[PDB]
Design a protein around this ligand. Structure first.
Ligand SMILES: CN1CCN(C)[C@H](CCN2CC[C@H](c3ccc(F)cc3)C2)C1
Ligand SMILES: CN1CCN(C)[C@H](CCN2CC[C@H](c3ccc(F)cc3)C2)C1
Lengths: 402, 409
């Protein structure tokens, strides 16, 4: 290679514990040799967040909002046990939450599938992109305890001083109970519509909506309605191009049609098996520019203690890798970077293809040969698996020089 | 059969399509030859519910409410194409819905475990009974639309008149959306508690309650606060009698714990959609039994659909390979329960013998294309690796004859 690819503007977010070591190995051995980036790196490790009073995570938020691409390493969501581990000054909020609240958009999870790994239904040769709602949860759902008898009613009082409307969720004639309250603004449904519609074009796959409008009068209905409204006003001519179609089926048919399906569609369902190390979540924002990619697991603290105590460790990096490769593939779309485009997809193909050739870590090996029959020779540690990914990537990029 | 065993009073429900065919094969080859029942048989087939204007289903529900055991066959719930198929005069409501709404109770789904069948990933040596809420969650779950900006909020005013809590659920600044309100009575969660202890009490496995506290803390807090007191004030001494117990772990803890445990526990989930490792692959291997809190009346049914695809093969003269194990275990679960109500030791042994010879026969290598595809791989399985539906019934009937004859000697 004459010159390294000109990446462009990407925001990088370092994490902590096991995945922090994976992260550097990934940059050092896979990304940096081949791509130069205008890198906006932030240190979202727990020590620094503690030291900067969580200010650094807010800066990351604002920087993805500007440069439209982010790739994030798994971070510790602390608790009471970890404020003794690091003597935190305060129980900080989740970094992942604080970016989803600031940046907005819709998370999309996808499991990466190798032809020689077990699966739930063995017909799913194409992966399934399941992305439900925003924020990690529809913000709150105020719920109380109704200790004794009395009416519980939910009221809507219009801001323009018009007639108030009460509904009566239940009158408790005798005995206790429990009560609940949800809601869903309208904008968050259009943001959900656009985000999910865009991923259908970005991936060239069909998009399905699933609801329970049969039981819920007009809560789940309002979803169906706004999608049809948006789907016929925009994106309908764009779907006709790339063969993609959209349709809304009932959730109970869709659950069985998933097993009936062969894979390769997007499923947005108004609400975890899978090696826990092959799943990559992507937050796609409503504008269709800014997008944060990251892995869907955690800091792998048990495998970090094996690293701390010097032990051998066999941790799986594919989930983190494909955070880089989705982020880079997105920037290559924005900048119309035809050469970063190919690099990203190539990187995705060695990971999957290096596993298909029998080179994998312990977790993947336990999926095939069962955990009680996994042998040292059936898997690689954490390093020499990256070493094998590295040289396979050098081998493949040299090939694709024509 | 010289004086075959006298099984009690039981309600039978006939279904639709290829499961209706299996139901007759089950009675003809497996049930009737060895048992005599005061049989309250109802025809829930689609064209009968259309002719009775769904009155046959209400009638069959009353019968289970009166006679305490019902054994159902998979039935068609109609849609737009089904009302055009049979030319129905109304898109009738699901019989399962209609009956569950009458009997009430809670539904438990048990996975039938065979040794030579790849069930998830080895490990599990015994099934797992997964139970969910009682009356769905609708009825009075009030939802609606928010026309414009304003404050949506929930107010609890006791019959005491002594206070009033107001919870803002959301203030609409933009204008527009949907809001709702749900609830649950203690009597409804107390029913979950009995039904779930009664089930654990029926078998000999321990009961677990997996709640979610990070999402709806206070809503789910009441569940572990209605179970543990009923367990302690009514069930702990009986559970402490046998090797049973009642604990309470958590969702992300339970799913990590169950992927190492040898199976054998009643699991109460409080979520809204189901098919974890339970509805895995071949639905032909899962039962489903509604339990009324009384512990008397129950209603078994195979957890899969009417298998339309194979009934079309039947109509065109093709040989089929549909798995009857689920419908076969609709009977034994329900016959074993009838035996418990009457101490019918003869019937409990039979029902139990049928659960053995059905698994024995699959473990022996004699199975249907349904299962064989799991072992070999669907393109791999040659004709010679499975059995016809009739072949499979014939070998059950054959091995059940030998299983009942031997222990009778
Ligand atoms: C993500 N959680 C955070 C909390 N705990 C420390 C968990 C313990 C690690 N488990 C054991 C192997 C699995 C695994 C395998 C490969 C991977 F790349 C990641 C995880 C998960 C992991
Ligand atoms: C089970 N429902 C029935 C209602 N639908 C029409 C669905 C189609 C049935 N598919 C055909 C082969 C599978 C199958 C094979 C053996 C079985 F015993 C059950 C299912 C599932 C699913």
């Amino acid at each position: 290679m004459s010159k390294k690819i000109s990446g462009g503007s990407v925001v990088e977010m370092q994490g902590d514990e096991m995945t922090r070591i994976i992260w550097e190995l990934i940059k050092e051995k896979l990304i940096f040799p081949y791509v130069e980036l205008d890198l906006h790196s932030y240190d979202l490790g727990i020590e620094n967040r503690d030291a900067t009073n969580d200010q650094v995570t807010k800066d990351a938020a604002e920087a993805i909002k500007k440069h439209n691409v982010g790739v994030k390493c798994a971070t510790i969501t602390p608790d009471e046990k970890r404020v003794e581990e690091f003597k935190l000054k305060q129980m900080w909020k989740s970094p992942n939450g604080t970016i989803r609240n600031i940046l907005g958009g819709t998370v999309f999870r996808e499991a990466i599938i190798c032809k020689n790994i077990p699966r739930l239904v063995s017909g799913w040769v194409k992966p399934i992109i399941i992305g439900h709602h925003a924020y990690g949860d529809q913000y709150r759902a105020t719920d109380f305890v109704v200790p004794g008898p009395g009416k519980v009613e939910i009221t809507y009082t219009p801001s323009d001083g018009t007639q108030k409307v009460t509904y009566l969720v239940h009158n408790f004639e005798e005995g206790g109970g429990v009560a609940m309250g949800m809601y869903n603004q309208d904008k968050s449904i259009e943001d959900f519509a656009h985000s999910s519609f865009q991923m259908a074009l970005s991936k060239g796959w069909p998009l399905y909506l699933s609801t329970k409008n049969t039981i819920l009068k007009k809560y789940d209905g309002r979803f169906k309605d706004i999608f049809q409204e948006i789907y016929d006003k925009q994106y309908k001519s764009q779907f006709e191009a790339q063969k993609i179609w959209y349709e809304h089926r009932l959730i109970d048919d869709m659950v069985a049609q998933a097993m009936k399906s062969e894979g390769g569609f997007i499923w947005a369902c108004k609400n975890g098996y899978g090696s826990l190390g092959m799943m990559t979540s992507v937050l796609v924002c409503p504008d269709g520019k800014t997008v944060e990619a990251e892995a869907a697991h955690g800091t792998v603290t048990r495998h970090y203690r094996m690293y701390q105590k010097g032990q051998e460790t066999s941790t799986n990096p594919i989930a983190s890798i494909f955070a880089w490769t989705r982020g880079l593939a997105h920037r290559a779309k924005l900048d119309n970077n035809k050469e970063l485009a190919f690099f990203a997809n190539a990187l995705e193909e060695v990971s999957i293809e290096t596993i298909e050739a029998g080179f994998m870590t312990k977790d993947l090996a336990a999926c095939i040969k069962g955990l009680p029959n996994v042998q040292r020779s059936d898997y690689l540690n954490t390093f020499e698996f990256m070493d094998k990914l590295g040289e396979n990537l050098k081998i493949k990029l040299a090939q694709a020089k024509l």
